[PDB]
Amino acid sequence: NALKSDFDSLRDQIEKAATNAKFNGVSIADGSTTKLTFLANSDGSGFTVNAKTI
């Protein structure tokens, strides 16, 4: 029972640590969106970074 409760605590910890990792409201580790596109060229062409949910 003690080992199970330790396991459960650690799982809840993983969840908290994962959902708090936002910068400026946008994040690539929670799983909110599928990809983020940044500017890479003075004409609008983008640099694509896929989302890696953890």
> What's the rounded Cα separation, in Å, for the pair 52 and 40?
21
> What's the rounded Cα separation, in Å, for the pair 32 and 44?
24
> Which position among 7, 12, 13, 20 is part of the footprint of other proteins (CB under 8 A)?
20
Q: Toward other proteins, which CB reaches closer, 13 or 20?
A: 20
Find the part of the chain contacting other proteins (CB under 8 A) among 2-10, 21-29, 31-39, 40-48.
Answer: 21-29
Residue 7 Cα distances to 2, 16, 19, 54, angstroms: 9, 14, 19, 18
Q: Toward other proteins, which CB reaches closer, 10 or 21?
A: 21
What is the binding site for other proteins (CB under 8 A)?
20-21, 23-24
